[PDB]
């Protein structure tokens, strides 16, 4: 019973989606540089910090076993995938989610769950992960989320969003998500939330 | 109990979505110029042609009362909205759909169901309806469908799809639908189909 909530920038249904109070918080995407945590904490969720960069694989496994859900924070998508691949936590996380551990993605966290992270090359710099060549995602979903699709963030203007569709729209099943939208994927069905 | 199936170019679930054999077929979008009918008929559906341009509202009412669903074919979106507004069938169709008549949109048919048709100005020419100024849609959904989003159709290349996002992505909640995808909207929920 895999359950996913792939948000562009979070959603009010996060705590209800977890169905519990304790959530492992993975912050490695932003490791190269608070607001996100307060979003979860304001809904009554307790955050168990899980920095994959500083956590041995055995401790990752047990931590994901003692929490009600996992949240992958936004940041640099390529850095996040690089950490996931190098640590080997990508397999641990995927296995736990496929076994029923609810997964909340935010921005980069939603992108890595898809088939690839190459489609966000114009949004997040691949240069932050010089030795990362294989951009294959976790594959939890077939949808390639493009977050912040409304261009409201100065960091990701609408011209960049349009460039992403032009460069990658043909090959990849882009799913543009605006801030406030999310994909609730449960029981093998994809619900588009507003 | 409003039920909608807004397809980019049809879907295998159309007949199951109807839950019946008889479907009123509205072809006015393509009136300015066959394969689409075969898609419905190949699924066992019986098409009752409903050309809004040549049908008085009294005949529209009885026709939609004797069928299990309505299908709005692709074509020129601006011409389709012009016909819907001028004939007054836009209110007749909206009322029955809101009363539970299942609605299948294809391309232009899915676009008119949204809040506006302005966002497809780069895909379909507004010039076909010179006197049409108010691009307000039927309002059946808050999502502004952008069909054929993969750029596979030569008439609608990916550069045009990206231009649509650049021009309208900020103001409107664009929902890019690729051929084979659909939005199944039932019981107040939006399901993204593949």
Resolution of the determined structure in angstroms stands at: 2.0
Report the DSSP pairing between strands B22-26 and B46-49. Answer: parallel
Cα angle A117-A120-A124, degrees, rounded to a multiple of 5: 105
Three-state secondary structure string covering chain B? CCEEEEECCCCCCHHHHHCCCEEEEECHHHCCCCHHHHHHHHCCCEEEECCHHHCCHHHHHHHHHCCCEEEECCCCHHHHHHHHHHHCHHHHHHHHHHCCCCEEEECHHHHHCCCECHHHCCCCCHHHCCCCCCCECCCCCCCEEECCCCCCCCCCCHHHHHHHHHHHCCCCCEEECCCCCEEEEECCEEEEEC
Q: Is the Cβ of B191 closer than 8 Å to some Cβ of chain A?
A: yes
Measured between CA atoms, the residue of chain A closest to residue B170 is A150
Region at B151 (left for phi over 0; alpha for psi -120 to 50; beta for the rest): left
Tokens representing residue B91 in the block? 């209110």
Q: How far lies A17's CA from each of A4, A56, A113, B93, in Å?
A: 9, 28, 17, 37
For residue B110, what are the domain limits? Answer: 1-194
Residue appearing with tokens 């098409």: B47
Interface of A with B in 22-61 (CB under 8 A): none
3-state secondary structure (DSSP) of residue A26: strand
Contact B190 A189 (CB under 8 A): no
List of residues 6+ apart from A104 with CB closer than 8 A: A4, A5, A6, A7, A14, A17, A18, A23, A69, A70, A71, A72
Residue of A nearest to B152 (CA): A170
The helix (H) or strand (E) run that includes residue A99 is none
- Tell me how many domains chain A contains: 1
Residue A27 has which token pair? Answer: 């912050």
Q: A22 phi and psi, to 5 degrees?
A: -105, 125
What technique solved it?
Answer: X-ray
CB contact under 8 A, B169 and A150: yes
Nearest CA to B38 among B17, B9, B66?
A: B9
Task: State residue B21 phi and psi, 5-degree precision.
Answer: -100, -25
CB proximity A162 to B under 8 Å: yes
Structure tokens at A117: 């992270």
Q: Is the Cβ pair B165, A165 closer than 8 Å?
A: yes
Contact B31, B81 (CB under 8 A): no
Angstrom distance (rounded) from CA A141 to CA A145: 9
Q: Which two tokens stand for residue B66?
A: 């004797």
> Alpha carbon of B78 to those of A145, A170, B27, B29, B74: distances in Å?
30, 26, 13, 8, 11
Measured in whole angstroms, the distance separating CA B152 from the mean position of its chain's CA atoms is 19
């Amino acid at each position: 019973h895999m359950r996913l909530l792939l948000t562009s920038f979070q959603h009010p249904s996060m705590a209800q989606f977890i169905g519990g109070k304790r959530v492992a918080y993975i912050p490695d995407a932003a490791r190269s540089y608070q607001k996100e945590r307060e979003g979860l904490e304001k809904q009554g969720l307790e955050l168990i910090n899980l920095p994959l960069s500083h956590t041995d694989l055995a401790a990752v496994e047990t931590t994901l076993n003692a929490v009600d859900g996992v949240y992958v924070a936004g940041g640099e998508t390529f850095d996040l995938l690089q950490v996931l691949r190098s640590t080997g936590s990508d397999k641990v996380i995927t296995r736990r989610v496929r076994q029923g551990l609810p997964y909340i993605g935010c921005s980069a966290g939603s992108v890595v769950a898809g088939p690839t992270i190459e489609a966000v090359s114009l949004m997040d710099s691949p240069d932050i992960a010089p030795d990362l060549k294989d951009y294959t995602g976790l594959g939890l979903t077939e949808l390639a989320v493009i977050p912040h699709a409304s261009g409201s963030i100065s960091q990701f203007p609408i011209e960049t969003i349009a460039d992403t569709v032009r460069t990658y729209g043909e090959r990849w099943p882009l799913c543009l998500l605006r801030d406030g939208q999310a994909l609730w994927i449960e029981d093998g069905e994809v619900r588009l939330l507003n």
